[PDB]
Coordinates of C-alpha atoms in Angstrom, one line a residue:
Chain A
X1 CA -12.8 -12.2 -4.7
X2 CA -9.6 -12.2 -2.7
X3 CA -6.4 -13.6 -4.3
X4 CA -3.9 -16.0 -2.8
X5 CA -0.4 -14.7 -1.7
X6 CA 2.9 -16.3 -0.8
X7 CA 5.3 -15.8 2.1
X8 CA 7.7 -12.8 2.3
Chain B
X1 CA -18.0 4.4 -16.9
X2 CA -15.0 4.0 -14.5
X3 CA -15.1 0.9 -12.1
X4 CA -12.6 -0.1 -9.6
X5 CA -12.1 -3.2 -7.5
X6 CA -9.4 -2.9 -4.8
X7 CA -8.2 -5.1 -1.9
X8 CA -5.9 -3.5 0.8
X9 CA -4.5 -5.2 3.9
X10 CA -2.5 -4.2 6.9
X11 CA -0.6 -6.3 9.5
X12 CA 0.9 -4.3 12.5
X13 CA 2.9 -5.2 15.5
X14 CA 1.2 -2.3 17.3
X15 CA -2.3 -2.0 16.2
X16 CA -3.3 0.4 19.0
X17 CA -6.2 0.9 21.5
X18 CA -9.2 -1.1 20.4
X19 CA -7.7 -2.6 17.3
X20 CA -7.0 -6.0 15.7
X21 CA -3.5 -6.5 14.4
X22 CA -4.5 -7.8 10.9
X23 CA -7.2 -6.1 8.8
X24 CA -8.0 -6.5 5.1
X25 CA -10.8 -4.8 3.2
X26 CA -12.2 -4.6 -0.3
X27 CA -13.8 -1.6 -2.1
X28 CA -15.9 -1.5 -5.3
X29 CA -16.1 2.0 -6.8
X30 CA -14.7 3.5 -3.7
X31 CA -17.4 1.6 -1.6
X32 CA -16.2 -0.7 1.3
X33 CA -18.0 -3.9 0.6
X34 CA -16.1 -6.6 2.5
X35 CA -14.1 -6.9 5.6
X36 CA -11.9 -9.3 7.5
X37 CA -9.9 -9.0 10.7
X38 CA -7.7 -11.1 13.0
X39 CA -10.2 -10.9 15.8
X40 CA -13.4 -12.0 14.0
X41 CA -11.5 -14.5 11.8
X42 CA -14.3 -14.4 9.3
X43 CA -14.8 -12.6 6.0
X44 CA -18.1 -10.6 6.3
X45 CA -20.2 -8.6 4.0
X46 CA -20.5 -4.9 4.4
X47 CA -23.2 -3.7 1.9
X48 CA -26.7 -5.1 1.2
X49 CA -26.1 -5.7 -2.5
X50 CA -23.1 -8.0 -1.9
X51 CA -24.9 -9.9 0.9
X52 CA -28.1 -10.3 -1.3
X53 CA -26.0 -11.8 -4.1
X54 CA -23.5 -14.2 -2.1
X55 CA -23.9 -17.6 -0.7
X56 CA -22.1 -18.9 2.3
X57 CA -19.7 -21.0 0.2
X58 CA -18.4 -17.5 -1.2
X59 CA -17.9 -16.2 2.4
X60 CA -16.3 -19.3 3.8
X61 CA -13.9 -19.4 0.8
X62 CA -13.1 -15.7 1.3
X63 CA -12.5 -16.5 5.0
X64 CA -10.2 -19.3 4.2
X65 CA -8.3 -17.0 1.8
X66 CA -8.1 -14.2 4.5
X67 CA -6.8 -16.7 7.2
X68 CA -4.1 -17.9 4.8
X69 CA -3.0 -14.3 4.0
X70 CA -3.3 -13.5 7.9
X71 CA -0.6 -15.9 8.7
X72 CA 1.3 -15.2 5.5
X73 CA 1.7 -11.6 6.9
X74 CA 2.1 -12.9 10.4
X75 CA 5.3 -14.7 9.2
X76 CA 6.2 -11.7 7.0
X77 CA 6.2 -9.3 9.9
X78 CA 8.9 -11.3 11.7
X79 CA 10.8 -12.0 8.5
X80 CA 11.1 -8.3 7.7
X81 CA 11.7 -7.3 11.4
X82 CA 15.0 -9.2 11.5
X83 CA 15.8 -8.8 7.9
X84 CA 16.2 -5.2 8.9
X85 CA 17.9 -6.3 12.1
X86 CA 15.3 -4.9 14.3
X87 CA 14.5 -6.0 17.8
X88 CA 10.8 -5.3 18.3
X89 CA 8.9 -2.1 18.2
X90 CA 6.3 -0.6 15.8
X91 CA 6.3 -2.0 12.4
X92 CA 3.7 -2.4 9.6
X93 CA 3.2 -4.5 6.4
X94 CA 0.7 -3.1 4.0
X95 CA -0.5 -4.5 0.7
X96 CA -2.9 -3.0 -2.0
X97 CA -3.9 -4.7 -5.3
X98 CA -6.7 -4.6 -7.7
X99 CA -8.1 -3.6 -11.2
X100 CA -9.6 -0.6 -12.9
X101 CA -12.0 -0.4 -16.0
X102 CA -11.3 3.0 -17.1
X103 CA -13.6 5.6 -18.8
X104 CA -11.9 4.7 -22.4
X105 CA -12.8 1.1 -21.7
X106 CA -9.4 -0.3 -21.2
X107 CA -8.3 -2.3 -18.1
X108 CA -5.3 -1.9 -15.7
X109 CA -4.2 -4.0 -12.8
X110 CA -1.8 -3.5 -10.0
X111 CA -0.2 -5.0 -6.9
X112 CA 2.2 -3.5 -4.4
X113 CA 3.5 -3.9 -0.8
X114 CA 5.0 -1.4 1.7
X115 CA 7.1 -2.0 4.7
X116 CA 6.9 0.7 7.5
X117 CA 4.9 3.0 5.3
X118 CA 7.4 3.0 2.3
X119 CA 7.4 1.3 -0.9
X120 CA 8.7 -2.2 -0.6
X121 CA 8.0 -4.0 -3.8
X122 CA 5.7 -3.6 -6.8
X123 CA 4.4 -5.8 -9.6
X124 CA 5.4 -5.0 -13.2
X125 CA 2.6 -7.1 -14.9
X126 CA 4.0 -6.4 -18.3
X127 CA 7.4 -7.8 -17.7
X128 CA 5.9 -10.4 -15.3
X129 CA 8.5 -9.3 -12.8
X130 CA 8.7 -7.8 -9.4
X131 CA 10.5 -4.4 -9.0
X132 CA 12.2 -3.9 -5.8
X133 CA 12.1 -0.5 -4.2
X134 CA 14.6 -1.2 -1.4
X135 CA 17.6 -3.7 -1.3
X136 CA 15.7 -5.7 1.4
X137 CA 13.1 -6.4 -1.4
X138 CA 15.7 -8.0 -3.8
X139 CA 15.2 -11.2 -1.5
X140 CA 11.5 -11.2 -1.6
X141 CA 11.4 -10.6 -5.5
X142 CA 13.4 -13.8 -6.0
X143 CA 11.1 -15.8 -3.8
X144 CA 8.2 -14.3 -5.8
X145 CA 9.8 -14.9 -9.2
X146 CA 10.2 -18.6 -8.6
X147 CA 7.5 -21.0 -9.9
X148 CA 4.6 -19.4 -11.8
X149 CA 3.2 -17.3 -9.0
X150 CA 3.9 -14.2 -11.1
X151 CA 1.8 -15.5 -14.0
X152 CA -1.0 -16.5 -11.7
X153 CA -0.9 -12.9 -10.3
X154 CA -1.0 -11.4 -13.9
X155 CA -3.9 -13.8 -14.7
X156 CA -5.9 -12.7 -11.6
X157 CA -5.3 -9.0 -12.1
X158 CA -6.3 -9.3 -15.8
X159 CA -9.0 -11.9 -15.8
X160 CA -10.3 -12.9 -12.4
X161 CA -10.3 -9.4 -11.0
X162 CA -12.0 -7.8 -13.9
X163 CA -14.9 -10.2 -14.2
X164 CA -15.5 -10.3 -10.5
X165 CA -15.6 -6.4 -10.6
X166 CA -18.0 -6.6 -13.5
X167 CA -20.2 -8.9 -11.5
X168 CA -20.0 -6.8 -8.4
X169 CA -20.9 -3.6 -10.4
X170 CA -23.8 -5.6 -11.8
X171 CA -25.0 -6.6 -8.3
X172 CA -25.1 -3.0 -6.9
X173 CA -25.9 -1.1 -10.0
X174 CA -28.8 0.7 -8.3
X175 CA -26.8 1.5 -5.0
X176 CA -23.4 2.5 -6.5
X177 CA -25.0 4.6 -9.4
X178 CA -27.1 6.4 -6.8
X179 CA -26.7 10.1 -6.4
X180 CA -27.1 12.1 -3.2
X181 CA -27.3 16.0 -3.5
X182 CA -25.0 17.8 -0.9
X183 CA -26.4 20.7 1.0
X184 CA -24.1 23.7 1.0
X185 CA -23.7 26.1 3.9
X186 CA -21.8 29.3 3.4
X187 CA -20.4 30.7 6.7
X188 CA -18.3 33.7 7.6
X189 CA -16.0 34.7 10.4
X190 CA -13.9 37.9 10.9
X191 CA -10.8 37.5 12.9
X192 CA -8.1 40.3 12.7
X193 CA -9.5 42.4 9.9
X194 CA -9.6 39.4 7.5
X195 CA -13.0 38.0 6.5
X196 CA -12.8 34.2 6.0
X197 CA -15.7 32.5 4.1
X198 CA -16.2 28.9 4.6
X199 CA -18.2 26.7 2.2
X200 CA -19.3 23.2 3.4
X201 CA -20.9 20.5 1.3
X202 CA -22.6 17.9 3.4
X203 CA -23.7 14.4 2.3
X204 CA -22.8 14.0 -1.4
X205 CA -22.4 10.8 -3.5
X206 CA -20.4 9.9 -5.4
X207 CA -17.1 11.1 -4.0
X208 CA -15.9 13.0 -7.1
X209 CA -16.8 16.8 -6.4
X210 CA -15.4 20.1 -7.4
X211 CA -15.9 22.9 -5.0
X212 CA -14.6 26.4 -6.0
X213 CA -14.8 30.0 -4.7
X214 CA -15.6 32.7 -7.3
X215 CA -14.8 36.4 -6.7
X216 CA -16.7 38.8 -8.9
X217 CA -17.4 36.0 -11.3
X218 CA -13.9 34.4 -11.6
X219 CA -12.7 31.1 -10.0
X220 CA -10.1 31.8 -7.3
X221 CA -7.6 29.1 -8.3
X222 CA -4.8 29.9 -5.8
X223 CA -6.8 31.5 -2.9
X224 CA -8.9 28.7 -1.8
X225 CA -7.9 26.4 1.2
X226 CA -9.6 23.0 1.4
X227 CA -9.7 20.1 3.8
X228 CA -10.0 17.6 0.9
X229 CA -12.9 15.1 0.6
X230 CA -13.7 13.5 4.0
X231 CA -16.1 10.6 4.6
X232 CA -19.4 10.6 6.5
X233 CA -20.4 7.6 8.6
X234 CA -23.1 6.6 6.1
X235 CA -21.5 6.2 2.6
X236 CA -21.7 9.9 1.8
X237 CA -18.9 12.5 1.8
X238 CA -18.2 16.0 3.0
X239 CA -16.0 18.8 2.1
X240 CA -15.1 22.4 3.2
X241 CA -13.3 25.1 1.4
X242 CA -12.2 28.4 2.9
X243 CA -11.0 31.7 1.4
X244 CA -9.6 35.0 2.8
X245 CA -10.8 38.4 1.7
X246 CA -11.3 41.8 2.9
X247 CA -14.4 42.8 4.8
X248 CA -16.7 44.6 2.3
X249 CA -15.8 42.3 -0.6
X250 CA -17.7 39.6 1.2
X251 CA -20.8 39.6 -0.9
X252 CA -18.9 39.1 -4.2
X253 CA -17.7 35.6 -3.3
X254 CA -19.9 32.7 -4.6
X255 CA -19.2 29.1 -3.7
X256 CA -19.7 26.9 -6.9
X257 CA -20.3 23.2 -6.4
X258 CA -20.0 20.7 -9.4
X259 CA -21.4 17.2 -8.6
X260 CA -23.0 14.5 -10.5
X261 CA -26.2 15.0 -8.5
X262 CA -26.5 18.5 -9.9
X263 CA -27.5 19.0 -13.6
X264 CA -26.2 22.5 -13.3
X265 CA -23.4 23.7 -10.8
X266 CA -24.7 25.0 -7.6
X267 CA -24.0 28.7 -6.8
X268 CA -24.3 29.8 -3.2
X269 CA -23.6 33.0 -1.3
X270 CA -22.8 34.4 2.2
Chain C
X1 CA 6.7 12.6 -6.1
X2 CA 4.7 12.8 -9.4
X3 CA 5.8 12.2 -12.9
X4 CA 4.4 12.6 -16.5
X5 CA 5.3 10.1 -19.2
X6 CA 4.3 8.6 -22.5
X7 CA 1.4 6.2 -22.0
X8 CA 3.3 3.8 -24.2
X9 CA 6.4 2.9 -22.3
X10 CA 8.0 1.8 -25.5
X11 CA 7.6 5.2 -27.3
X12 CA 10.9 7.2 -27.4
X13 CA 10.0 10.1 -29.7
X14 CA 6.7 11.4 -31.0
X15 CA 6.0 11.2 -34.7
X16 CA 4.9 14.0 -37.1
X17 CA 1.3 14.1 -38.0
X18 CA 0.2 11.6 -35.4
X19 CA -1.5 11.5 -32.1
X20 CA 0.7 11.4 -28.9
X21 CA -0.6 10.5 -25.5
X22 CA 0.9 11.7 -22.5
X23 CA -0.1 11.0 -18.9
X24 CA 0.4 12.0 -15.3
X25 CA -0.6 10.3 -12.0
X26 CA -0.8 12.9 -9.2
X27 CA -0.2 12.0 -5.7
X28 CA -3.8 13.4 -4.9
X29 CA -6.7 13.1 -7.5
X30 CA -9.4 15.1 -5.5
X31 CA -7.9 18.0 -7.7
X32 CA -7.6 18.7 -11.3
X33 CA -4.3 19.2 -13.1
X34 CA -3.0 21.5 -15.7
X35 CA -0.9 20.3 -18.7
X36 CA 1.8 22.8 -19.8
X37 CA 4.4 22.6 -22.6
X38 CA 7.8 24.2 -22.2
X39 CA 9.7 25.1 -25.4
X40 CA 13.5 24.4 -25.5
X41 CA 13.9 28.2 -25.3
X42 CA 11.9 28.1 -22.0
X43 CA 8.6 29.8 -22.8
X44 CA 5.8 28.0 -21.0
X45 CA 2.4 27.3 -22.6
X46 CA -0.8 26.6 -20.9
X47 CA -2.5 23.6 -22.7
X48 CA -5.5 22.6 -20.6
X49 CA -6.9 22.1 -17.0
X50 CA -8.7 18.9 -16.3
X51 CA -11.1 19.0 -13.2
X52 CA -11.6 16.1 -10.9
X53 CA -15.0 15.5 -12.8
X54 CA -13.0 14.9 -16.2
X55 CA -13.9 18.7 -17.0
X56 CA -11.3 20.2 -19.4
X57 CA -10.4 23.8 -19.9
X58 CA -8.0 25.2 -22.6
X59 CA -7.0 28.8 -23.4
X60 CA -10.1 31.3 -23.8
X61 CA -12.5 29.2 -21.8
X62 CA -13.8 26.6 -24.2
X63 CA -13.9 22.8 -23.5
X64 CA -13.5 22.2 -27.2
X65 CA -10.2 21.8 -29.1
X66 CA -9.2 20.7 -32.6
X67 CA -5.8 20.1 -31.1
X68 CA -5.9 18.6 -27.6
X69 CA -7.9 16.0 -25.8
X70 CA -8.0 16.0 -21.9
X71 CA -9.5 13.3 -19.7
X72 CA -9.4 11.6 -16.3
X73 CA -8.9 7.9 -16.6
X74 CA -9.0 5.9 -13.3
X75 CA -6.3 7.6 -11.1
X76 CA -4.6 9.3 -14.0
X77 CA -4.8 12.4 -16.0
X78 CA -4.5 12.2 -19.8
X79 CA -3.5 14.5 -22.5
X80 CA -3.7 13.7 -26.3
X81 CA -2.2 15.7 -29.1
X82 CA -4.5 14.7 -31.8
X83 CA -1.9 15.4 -34.6
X84 CA 1.6 16.0 -33.3
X85 CA 3.7 18.5 -35.4
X86 CA 6.8 20.6 -35.0
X87 CA 5.2 23.3 -32.8
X88 CA 4.0 20.6 -30.3
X89 CA 7.6 19.7 -29.6
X90 CA 8.8 20.5 -26.1
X91 CA 9.0 19.2 -22.5
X92 CA 5.4 18.5 -21.1
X93 CA 4.7 19.1 -17.5
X94 CA 1.8 18.4 -15.3
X95 CA 0.9 20.7 -12.4
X96 CA -1.3 20.1 -9.4
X97 CA -2.5 23.2 -7.4
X98 CA -3.5 21.8 -3.8
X99 CA -4.1 24.0 -0.9
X100 CA -2.5 27.1 -2.5
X101 CA 0.6 25.2 -3.1
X102 CA 1.9 24.2 -6.6
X103 CA 3.3 20.8 -7.4
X104 CA 5.2 20.0 -10.5
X105 CA 5.5 16.5 -12.0
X106 CA 8.5 15.4 -13.8
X107 CA 8.9 16.7 -17.3
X108 CA 8.5 14.5 -20.4
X109 CA 10.6 15.5 -23.4
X110 CA 8.7 15.1 -26.8
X111 CA 10.9 16.0 -29.8
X112 CA 11.1 14.4 -33.3
Chain D
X1 CA 3.8 12.1 9.6
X2 CA 1.5 13.8 11.9
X3 CA -2.3 13.3 11.6
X4 CA -4.5 15.8 10.0
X5 CA -7.8 16.2 11.9
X6 CA -11.1 17.5 10.8
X7 CA -14.2 17.8 12.9
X8 CA -17.6 18.4 11.2
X9 CA -21.2 17.4 11.5
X10 CA -23.0 15.2 9.0
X11 CA -25.7 17.8 8.5
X12 CA -25.3 21.6 9.1
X13 CA -26.0 21.9 12.7
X14 CA -29.1 23.5 14.2
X15 CA -29.8 23.3 17.8
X16 CA -32.3 20.7 18.6
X17 CA -32.1 18.8 15.2
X18 CA -30.4 15.5 15.6
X19 CA -27.1 15.0 13.7
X20 CA -23.8 13.1 13.7
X21 CA -20.5 14.5 14.8
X22 CA -17.4 13.2 12.9
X23 CA -13.7 13.5 13.7
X24 CA -11.5 12.2 10.7
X25 CA -7.7 11.9 10.9
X26 CA -5.6 11.2 7.9
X27 CA -2.1 11.0 6.6
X28 CA -0.6 9.7 9.7
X29 CA 1.9 6.8 10.5
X30 CA 2.3 4.4 12.5
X31 CA -1.4 3.2 12.5
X32 CA -1.7 3.4 16.2
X33 CA -3.9 6.4 17.1
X34 CA -6.3 7.5 19.8
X35 CA -9.3 9.6 18.9
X36 CA -12.1 10.5 21.2
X37 CA -15.3 12.6 20.7
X38 CA -15.9 15.0 23.7
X39 CA -18.8 17.3 24.7
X40 CA -17.7 19.8 27.5
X41 CA -14.6 17.8 28.1
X42 CA -16.4 14.4 28.7
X43 CA -16.1 11.5 26.3
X44 CA -19.5 11.1 24.3
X45 CA -21.0 7.6 24.3
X46 CA -22.3 5.6 21.4
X47 CA -19.0 6.6 19.5
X48 CA -17.7 4.3 16.7
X49 CA -14.3 3.9 15.0
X50 CA -14.1 3.1 11.3
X51 CA -11.8 0.1 10.4
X52 CA -8.2 0.8 9.7
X53 CA -7.6 2.0 6.2
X54 CA -4.9 3.8 4.3
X55 CA -4.6 5.7 1.0
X56 CA -2.4 5.5 -2.1
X57 CA 0.7 6.9 -0.2
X58 CA 0.4 4.3 2.5
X59 CA -0.7 6.9 5.1
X60 CA -3.5 5.8 7.4
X61 CA -7.0 7.2 8.2
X62 CA -9.7 6.7 10.8
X63 CA -13.1 8.2 11.0
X64 CA -14.9 8.4 14.5
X65 CA -18.6 9.4 14.7
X66 CA -21.4 9.8 17.1
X67 CA -25.0 10.6 16.9
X68 CA -26.0 13.7 18.9
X69 CA -28.3 16.6 19.2
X70 CA -26.3 19.9 19.2
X71 CA -26.8 22.4 21.9
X72 CA -25.3 25.9 21.9
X73 CA -23.5 26.9 25.0
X74 CA -21.9 23.4 24.9
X75 CA -18.6 22.8 23.3
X76 CA -17.8 19.8 21.2
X77 CA -14.2 18.7 20.4
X78 CA -12.0 15.8 19.4
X79 CA -9.0 14.6 21.3
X80 CA -6.2 13.0 19.3
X81 CA -3.1 11.2 20.6
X82 CA -0.4 9.9 18.4
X83 CA 3.3 9.0 18.7
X84 CA 4.5 11.9 16.4
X85 CA 2.8 14.3 18.8
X86 CA 4.5 15.3 22.1
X87 CA 1.1 15.8 23.7
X88 CA -2.6 15.3 22.9
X89 CA -4.2 17.7 20.5
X90 CA -7.8 18.9 20.7
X91 CA -9.8 20.1 17.8
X92 CA -12.9 22.3 18.6
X93 CA -16.0 21.9 16.4
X94 CA -17.6 25.0 14.9
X95 CA -21.4 24.5 14.7
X96 CA -21.6 27.4 12.1
Chain E
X1 CA 1.3 40.6 -19.7
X2 CA 3.2 39.4 -16.7
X3 CA 7.0 39.6 -16.1
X4 CA 9.0 38.3 -13.2
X5 CA 12.2 40.3 -12.9
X6 CA 14.9 42.0 -11.3
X7 CA 13.5 45.0 -9.5
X8 CA 16.7 46.8 -10.6
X9 CA 16.8 46.3 -14.3
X10 CA 20.4 47.4 -14.4
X11 CA 21.3 44.4 -12.4
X12 CA 22.3 41.5 -14.6
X13 CA 23.5 38.9 -12.0
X14 CA 22.6 38.2 -8.5
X15 CA 25.2 38.6 -5.8
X16 CA 26.5 35.8 -3.5
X17 CA 25.5 36.0 0.1
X18 CA 23.3 39.1 -0.3
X19 CA 19.5 39.5 -0.6
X20 CA 18.3 39.4 -4.2
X21 CA 14.8 41.0 -4.8
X22 CA 12.8 40.0 -7.7
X23 CA 9.6 41.8 -8.7
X24 CA 6.6 40.9 -10.9
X25 CA 4.2 43.0 -13.0
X26 CA 1.0 41.1 -13.6
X27 CA -1.5 41.8 -16.2
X28 CA -4.2 42.3 -13.5
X29 CA -3.1 43.3 -10.1
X30 CA -6.4 42.2 -8.5
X31 CA -4.9 38.6 -8.3
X32 CA -2.1 36.9 -6.5
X33 CA 0.9 35.3 -8.0
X34 CA 3.2 32.4 -7.4
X35 CA 6.9 32.5 -7.6
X36 CA 8.8 29.5 -9.0
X37 CA 12.4 28.7 -9.8
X38 CA 13.6 26.4 -12.7
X39 CA 16.9 24.6 -11.9
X40 CA 19.9 24.0 -14.2
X41 CA 18.3 20.5 -14.5
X42 CA 15.1 22.0 -15.7
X43 CA 13.1 20.9 -12.5
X44 CA 10.7 23.3 -11.3
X45 CA 10.4 24.4 -7.6
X46 CA 7.5 26.2 -5.8
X47 CA 8.7 29.0 -3.7
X48 CA 5.8 31.0 -2.5
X49 CA 2.3 32.2 -3.2
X50 CA 1.4 35.9 -2.7
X51 CA -2.3 36.8 -2.3
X52 CA -3.8 40.2 -3.2
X53 CA -3.8 40.7 0.6
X54 CA 0.0 40.6 0.4
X55 CA -0.3 37.2 2.2
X56 CA 2.0 34.5 1.1
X57 CA 1.9 30.7 1.3
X58 CA 5.1 28.7 1.6
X59 CA 5.6 24.8 1.1
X60 CA 3.9 22.2 3.0
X61 CA 1.3 24.8 4.1
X62 CA 3.2 27.4 5.9
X63 CA 3.8 31.2 6.2
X64 CA 7.1 30.9 7.8
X65 CA 10.4 31.2 5.8
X66 CA 13.9 31.8 7.2
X67 CA 15.1 32.2 3.6
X68 CA 12.3 33.9 1.7
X69 CA 10.0 36.9 1.7
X70 CA 6.9 37.5 -0.4
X71 CA 4.7 40.5 -0.5
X72 CA 2.8 42.9 -2.9
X73 CA 3.5 46.5 -3.0
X74 CA 2.3 49.2 -5.2
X75 CA 1.3 47.6 -8.4
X76 CA 3.9 44.8 -8.2
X77 CA 4.8 41.6 -6.5
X78 CA 8.0 41.0 -4.5
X79 CA 10.1 38.0 -3.9
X80 CA 13.2 38.4 -1.7
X81 CA 15.8 35.6 -1.3
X82 CA 17.2 36.7 2.0
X83 CA 20.7 35.3 1.3
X84 CA 21.1 34.3 -2.2
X85 CA 23.6 31.3 -2.5
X86 CA 24.6 29.0 -5.4
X87 CA 21.7 26.9 -3.9
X88 CA 19.3 29.5 -5.2
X89 CA 20.5 29.8 -8.8
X90 CA 18.0 29.4 -11.6
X91 CA 15.4 31.1 -13.8
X92 CA 12.6 32.8 -11.7
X93 CA 9.1 32.7 -13.1
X94 CA 5.7 34.1 -12.1
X95 CA 2.4 32.2 -12.3
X96 CA -1.1 33.6 -12.1
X97 CA -4.1 31.1 -11.6
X98 CA -7.2 33.0 -13.0
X99 CA -10.3 31.1 -13.8
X100 CA -8.5 27.7 -13.7
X101 CA -6.1 29.0 -16.3
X102 CA -2.3 29.5 -15.8
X103 CA -0.4 32.6 -17.0
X104 CA 3.4 32.5 -17.1
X105 CA 5.6 35.5 -16.9
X106 CA 8.5 35.6 -19.3
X107 CA 11.0 34.7 -16.6
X108 CA 14.3 36.2 -15.2
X109 CA 17.6 34.3 -15.2
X110 CA 19.5 34.5 -11.9
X111 CA 23.0 33.0 -12.1
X112 CA 26.4 34.2 -10.7

């Protein structure tokens, strides 16, 4: 399962 | 023994002829098993053991995650473009993360990002910190070290990642533990008085292989030239190894192939 | 770019009579590596070659050692000195021979 | 850096036996790349491009393959175009 | 066994701005060798590989050097620093890769 990210 | 789960992703300002600008893909034990891109907009299966063991809610949730990350990196491209004071051109954001269950049975997890093909920022899980590789990553580090996002990433790379890897490995136990025997061809060409022997291994699986030349019984450590391990279009792999010699010593060279699909190493001659 | 280190990032010196794990992550793992130890004097000692199939080869041509363990773990190569003593002191290097070129990892000092 | 290109068949070629011709480019950057399989200077049809991938050093890779039946007296090649190259480069396939 | 050396053994130090020829006596002269240099720091550098066909291999897969020459003549191997500078100072070693095992010459210091 893919994970969630945050903005650069 | 060894099992790997890895997700990689690329956003590009210049994807090239025929290409979508955002593409993320996943691999289990080196095998591409899921794929998403900015044109299809939908996370899709890529093997028959992941499709046979996944519902639609799995794929819709993976698609929502992939769309969230697609615009995260859409924003990130512009953010970094003028963080570097750049006015357009060719730029690339890359990310790769995942986990490994190694042959000694311990687990490792990783996550790292690159800008324009160079290390941008990496995750030090142990410290729960973000190591900046460039000054321009000191900013992102702060943004990534606020709240609990770092601890969520640790928990993903240590728990979520590893158990989903275990389940994927169970799903495709037959297919990933399969073994395909390579066929080895020994060829030879004479150019300007130098005889060059080629050894080609076609269609082997898994990817780990050891191909060596032997001259009168001894491995030629420093004389072999190799193209590395290259992929076939069907989940198998290929490799070629050349060596130079004098004509007349040509029948003393043996190509030795070590691969899991061989109970004993294969010895082939010209 | 390639470097050998203690697998335990807290370790600062080996300890007499006990196992020492060193490790090296090559830039390319379609090839084996070779572990070597350099004295302070400078003489270099071959320890073992580890193939991409986690196949290990020590001095003579043996695959069995009282004294070292080699292995491939994920994308890393691993050396274990089962019982580290004074003769095992030195700077430990990792060496990848790819395409007739030699590549040297960073040295890891290991002294009491 | 510049792409490294290999042209090889999926099985050892024999004239008349069906096979797949592959052109693999690795270790290049930026991801933009043009790769075309050719027989006798003409682009082959039914050609496919693997999705964009990269390896541990962030360098990119692409595989292009096409089903075909080898014929001696006909030359097979792969044409590569990349920013780091002044001009296109053409890699001949050796049937062996 | 193998020794990488000054081809003139009366010579005790290289000479600034002039070619420096080192030479290497292998245990077996049916195999190529590799010339390396060890820095003041202790860092190792690959210089050239010389095959039994007197064919050499330079860094990032070349056979073109505007500052080195490799070849094998009679029963010995030759490394030539075309123009020995302070940039080239260090201890020069020889490396034989036979049967996936590494053999190291004793080594020749080369400092002004």
